[PDB]
Design a binder for this molecule. Structure first.
Ligand SMILES: O=C(O)[C@H]1[C@H](c2ccccc2)[C@H](C(=O)Oc2cccc3ccccc23)[C@H]1c1ccccc1
Ligand SMILES: CCCCCCCCCCCCCC(=O)O
Length: 134
């Protein structure tokens, strides 16, 4: 219901369709297997205006900060330069990515106290579940 319920550190506990989603993004099989094997924490921070999302695995960290509602450029882990906008809408944090006439949406919402992250591109959907650790 609020963005503050999404703030904190989350640990990945379940994943479904992530390989199909990365494949839809154009990610090579090597990066797909590395991404599938990773069990990253996700740290979400928000000061009212600025949203920061950090993804942390052993030896690998990526993080971006943006202003909610304002377009910005994202450098994704697979190496896309996207135009991205993050909004909080209808109880979910929605991250919309646009690049090369393509687009993808990552939605993060609270469900039964867990963080449910659904990544969509074209007609491929992936769902990843994290538990609160901090
Ligand atoms: O550029 C590289 O060599 C690597 C990229 C990268 C590593 C760390 C920070 C940002 C980007 C990809 C990669 O390792 O993604 C992840 C995989 C698994 C877990 C991750 C957790 C946090 C951040 C990134 C992760 C590597 C890569 C290889 C080839 C083409 C593009 C990217
Ligand atoms: C860290 C996952 C592997 C990174 C390489 C593939 C790029 C996929 C980007 C989408 C990952 C974000 C979804 C999530 O928070 O679980």
């Amino acid at each position: 219901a609020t963005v503050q319920q999404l703030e904190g550190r989350w640990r990945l506990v379940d994943s479904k369709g992530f390989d199909e989603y990365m494949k839809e993004l154009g990610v090579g099989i090597a990066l797909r297997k590395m991404g599938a094997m990773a069990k990253p924490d996700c740290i979400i921070t928000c000061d009212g205006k600025n949203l920061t999302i950090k993804t942390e695995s052993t030896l690998k960290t990526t993080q971006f900060s943006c202003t909610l509602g304002e377009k910005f450029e994202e450098t994704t882990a697979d190496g896309r330069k996207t135009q991205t906008v993050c909004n909080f809408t209808d109880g979910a944090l929605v991250q919309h990515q646009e690049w090369d006439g393509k687009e993808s949406t990552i939605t993060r919402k609270l469900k039964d106290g867990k963080l449910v992250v659904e990544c969509v591109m074209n007609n491929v959907t992936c769902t990843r579940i994290y538990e609160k650790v901090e």
